[PDB]
Design a binder for this molecule. Structure first.
Ligand SMILES: [Zn+2]
Lengths: 150, 258, 124, 208
RNA sequence: GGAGGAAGAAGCCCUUCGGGGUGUAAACUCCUGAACCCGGGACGAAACCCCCGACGAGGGGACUGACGGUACCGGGGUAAUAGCGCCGGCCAACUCCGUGCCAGCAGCCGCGGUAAUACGGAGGGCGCGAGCGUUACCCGGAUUCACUGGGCGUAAAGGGCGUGUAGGCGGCCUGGGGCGUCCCAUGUGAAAGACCACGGCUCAACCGUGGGGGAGCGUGGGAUACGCUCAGGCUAGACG
RNA sequence: AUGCGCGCUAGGUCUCUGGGUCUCCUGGGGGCCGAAGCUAACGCGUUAAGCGCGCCGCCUGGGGAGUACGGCCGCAAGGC
């Protein structure tokens, strides 16, 4: 039901008693193109193990995007550490206008029309986290009405 | 490489028994042959790489059923090997996977040589599979249908979506079963003449059959009126396209004015 | 900075500095060689690079790199000089175009003929 | 100067059956029935996972080769479509269809686009009872497209349209086989065509 | 040039020496006719000028084409130019042979000392196409002068401190003025260019007709919430 | 290695110096742990490096270099 693609594979090293030990990190996004998305980061000695662990993690850290006409309800700017993300709604027939990481995250969420921008530090991990945070902080007309009026 | 459960399904649809023998073409790594050895009795492999062969020599070391023959599948006396290796088995099947380009010629050869089999099970390609098993009045009905129903009864048992492959291919796949019949459906006075007539009939889809027969046949122009008269006596319409005709309809014409 | 400070002082604009002073805002220049010789690259690299000391129409003396497999440059050859920096050589900021005035396109090139002169070889 | 040379080579590179040859690509010799792998020495070799840029470029290329226009003309049409009102994808697809060569192909005067271009170029086709010899001509809703009086007796046209008898034309076109003519009713919708193309990929490709 | 056209012609390259790549490309069959040859042949040009008018408004009469025998029409007509860059990552597209930190490549990272998908050649493949690359300059990416939209403990960045001039900013409760501010009407914002619609060159570039939009400024008339000013009161800032 | 002024935002503990109805309550300083919050991190956290407003000073990659020329100051070294 959930389809998977890779954000990035990296190999990190740590010193030992005369030698180097390498561990692989995977950033994985999962989705259904229906308004649900998940992100995970998996660290393991081996690449397949890293991918499995990252997917496993992503399958619980789950977010529902309030899609409407395949676009974001409203614009939002979000800061995570030294990274900044900007998302803006688009009219039907625009397309996903994003970098590798934001495009990958937004496509699986079912978003079809959006204008994005990256500011400050452009480290993939922080950009991905910022994107997820921005997605989590989205509201619709109904939600605002319910909170205000009641 | 394919998912390990699908191959089980193809083997099941081969109705393999502990008594039957199988001829497998192009094992490659050797997924299929493995999942055969188990339920089969004797496996013979025709394969020519010298590159993936060490992998193949290894993968089959467990079993004592499987044997490898380093000979061309097309440059082989199939009768000889079938009689030589299989003196003990009751029935014989053929299950294999073919490497695109040379898929039609192999099947054509195995059928024209009228080997003592029960059936052929091959993955083939979806489009080719559809073309093989078609009713007379289809859109994809053609020469290939005539060629295969002339030797066997053919039907596609299942469909293989293009998604189940790790290297994503450009085209789909199917699984087809071709049970040999105990002799051709219709008698022919000359098998060659039948073959040229079939190929000439479906040369141009859009044009009517009569035009195709008169033009395509090498000496058709020499004897035009003769063709029309023979067609008329058979109660077959010239203005009718060749697509609609069934096997027997063409067979009568093949008899015709030989 | 406060808006009042912006009003009082404003913002300084950055000026781009030309990397090719000799050409004086021209695509190419015409010069005459004076010294034809070879030099050695920096520490990572090790080769012999052909370099010509060219006097241009403008009152500048420069060093230009000679690309290709072989050349035919004397000490009086009229040459055309083009923009382009050679990293490893410390001081050359210019190139020589093949097959223009006195420099000829290097022989028997077959792949990149747009550069290095080389009229198309007619094959029977 | 359009692309002249091998055709079903593209069938292959693109991995999808692009009907660019006529009726040969309906026989068992489409070159996709056989050898359905990318053209070249390295055609059967494990393919590395395609980049996003590669995917977008391939989608864009697929489309362009279906209609057989240049990159320049394609870009101009895209720019024109983007500027107009409505969904960029639908408008863009509409514009490409209105090509006179496209239309005469769709009506069935030719089996291929490559020869539809030839028939339109050589003055065999007329619009509103006036000779037009330009493949790039854009037809508006309500135009009448017919065969020239002089060209009615040619065997090619007769053979082509004879095969068209007893087959439904596209819902946005009308045909009269007897009079050897046709009428442009309206701009085709997104669903009305069936081109194997995801237009969003083309839009994003040109967005960069 | 188009359609048809082999489980696949030779040549060349690769190879595990079994074939597979160029590749329906070709060779061939049928078909349409860029060029070329005959016969016509333009729109742009109706006025000035005369004829009755009145010497007017009306109505008739001819003369005038560089472009040019060009564009374009009507017949007859032969398959009849393809190049350039790139193929290590950015960035689409991989294999042999030659040389061994040499000859070279290089926009950045860097590649070259026996494997080198990075140099040269070949095969093959991508991109564009009568064009394709290189250099020079401008904007962008550069949120890398940050008004929109950056910062100053340790990365560059708080003056060594105080007093204070100009300047900048400023508590709350009623009034008057209407300078800033907002609104309405009107004049201007030429033509061309930009946008939209329609139309004429066989289409498009190109051009024409029409419709708006438009920052800003002048004139006339309205509002007083905020900033400003002029009057009066208060004590929560400050001072005694 | 932290410009000045004002307002708001949990507390606990030690200490210096005032006042009251005196074991506590209420001002003004000097430190230590820490809510929320901020930071790239170390850490800051009613003595903010938080949330804000007002005004001034300064930054635009490293080296060359606080160097060269010019000007002002000083007897000179030298400083801006
Ligand atoms: Zn095809």
């Amino acid at each position: 039901d959930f389809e998977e693609k890779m954000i990035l594979i990296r190999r990190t090293a740590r010193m030992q008693a005369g030698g180097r030990r390498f561990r692989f990190g995977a950033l994985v996004v999962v989705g259904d193109r229906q308004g649900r998305v998940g992100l995970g980061f998996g660290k393991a000695p081996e690449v397949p193990l890293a991918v499995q662990k990252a997917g496993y993690y992503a399958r619980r850290n789950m977010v529902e995007v309030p899609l409407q006409n395949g676009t974001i309800p409203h614009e939002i700017e979000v800061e995570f550490g030294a990274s900044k993300i900007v998302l803006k709604p688009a009219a039907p027939g625009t397309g996903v206008i994003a970098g590798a990481v934001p495009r990958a995250i937004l496509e699986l969420a079912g978003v079809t029309d959006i204008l994005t921008k990256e500011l400050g530090s452009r480290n993939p991990i922080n950009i991905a986290y910022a994107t997820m945070e921005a997605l989590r902080q989205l509201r619709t007309k109904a939600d605002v009405e319910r909170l205000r009026k009641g | 490489l394919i998912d390990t459960n699908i191959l089980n399904r193809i083997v099941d649809h081969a109705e393999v028994t502990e008594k039957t023998g199988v001829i497998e073409i192009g094992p490659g790594i050797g997924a299929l042959t493995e999942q055969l050895a188990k339920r089969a009795k004797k496996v013979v492999a025709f394969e020519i790489d010298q590159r993936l062969l060490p992998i193949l020599k290894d993968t089959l070391s467990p079993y004592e059923n499987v044997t490898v023959i380093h000979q061309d599948v097309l440059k082989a006396d199939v009768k000889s090997v079938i009689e030589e290796q299989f003196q003990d088995c009751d029935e014989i099947m053929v299950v294999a996977n073919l490497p695109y380009y040379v898929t039609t010629p192999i099947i054509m050869k195995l059928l024209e040589e009228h080997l003592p089999l029960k059936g052929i099970v091959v993955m083939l390609q979806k489009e080719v599979a559809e073309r093989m098993a078609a009713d007379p009045s289809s859109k994809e009905y053609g020469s290939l249908s005539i060629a295969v129903q002339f030797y066997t009864e053919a039907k596609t048992v299942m469909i293989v979506p293009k998604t189940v492959f790790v290297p994503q291919p450009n085209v789909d796949s199917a699984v087809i079963r071709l049970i040999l019949r105990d002799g051709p459906a219709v008698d022919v006075e000359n098998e060659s003449f039948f073959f040229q007539l079939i190929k000439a009939s479906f040369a141009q889809r859009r044009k009517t059959l009569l035009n195709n027969l008169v033009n395509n046949l090498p000496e058709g122009k020499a004897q035009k009126s003769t063709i029309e008269q023979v067609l008329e006596e058979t109660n077959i319409d010239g203005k009718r396209r060749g697509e609609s005709l069934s096997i027997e309809e063409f067979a009568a014409l093949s008899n015709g004015l030989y | 900075p406060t808006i009042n400070q912006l009003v009082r002082k404003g913002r300084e604009k950055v000026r781009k500095k030309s990397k090719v002073p000799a050409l004086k805002g021209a695509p190419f220049r015409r010069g005459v060689c004076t010294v034809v010789r070879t030099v050695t690259p920096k520490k990572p690299n090790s080769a012999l690079r052909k370099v010509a000391k060219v006097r241009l129409t403008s009152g500048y003396e420069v060093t230009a790199y000679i690309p290709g497999e072989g050349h035919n440059l004397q000490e009086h050859s009229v040459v055309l000089i083009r923009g382009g920096r050679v990293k490893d050589l410390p001081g050359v900021r210019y190139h020589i175009v093949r097959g223009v005035y006195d420099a000829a396109g290097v022989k028997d090139r077959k792949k990149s003929r747009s550069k290095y002169g080389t009229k198309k070889p007619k094959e029977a | 100067g359009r692309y002249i040379g091998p055709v079903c080579r593209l069938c292959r590179r693109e991995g999808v059956k692009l009907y660019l040859k006529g009726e040969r690509c309906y026989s068992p010799k489409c070159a996709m029935e056989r050898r359905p792998y990318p053209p070249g020495q390295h055609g059967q070799k494990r393919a590395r996972r395609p980049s996003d840029y590669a995917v977008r470029l391939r989608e864009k290329q697929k489309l362009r080769r279906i209609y057989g226009i240049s990159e320049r003309q394609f870009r101009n049409l895209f720019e024109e479509a983007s500027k107009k009102k409505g969904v960029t994808g639908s408008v863009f697809l509409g514009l490409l269809e209105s090509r006179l060569d496209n239309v005469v192909y769709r009506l069935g005067f030719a089996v291929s686009r490559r020869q539809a271009r030839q028939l339109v170029r050589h003055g065999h086709i007329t619009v509103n009872g006036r000779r037009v010899d330009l493949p790039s001509y854009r037809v508006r809703p309500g135009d009448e497209i017919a065969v020239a009086e002089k060209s009615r007796n040619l065997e090619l046209i007769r053979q082509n349209l004879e095969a068209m008898k007893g087959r439904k034309v596209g819902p946005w076109l009308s045909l009269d086989v007897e009079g050897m003519k046709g009428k442009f009713l309206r701009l085709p919708d997104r669903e009305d065509l069936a081109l194997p193309v995801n237009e969003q990929l083309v839009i994003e490709f040109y967005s960069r």
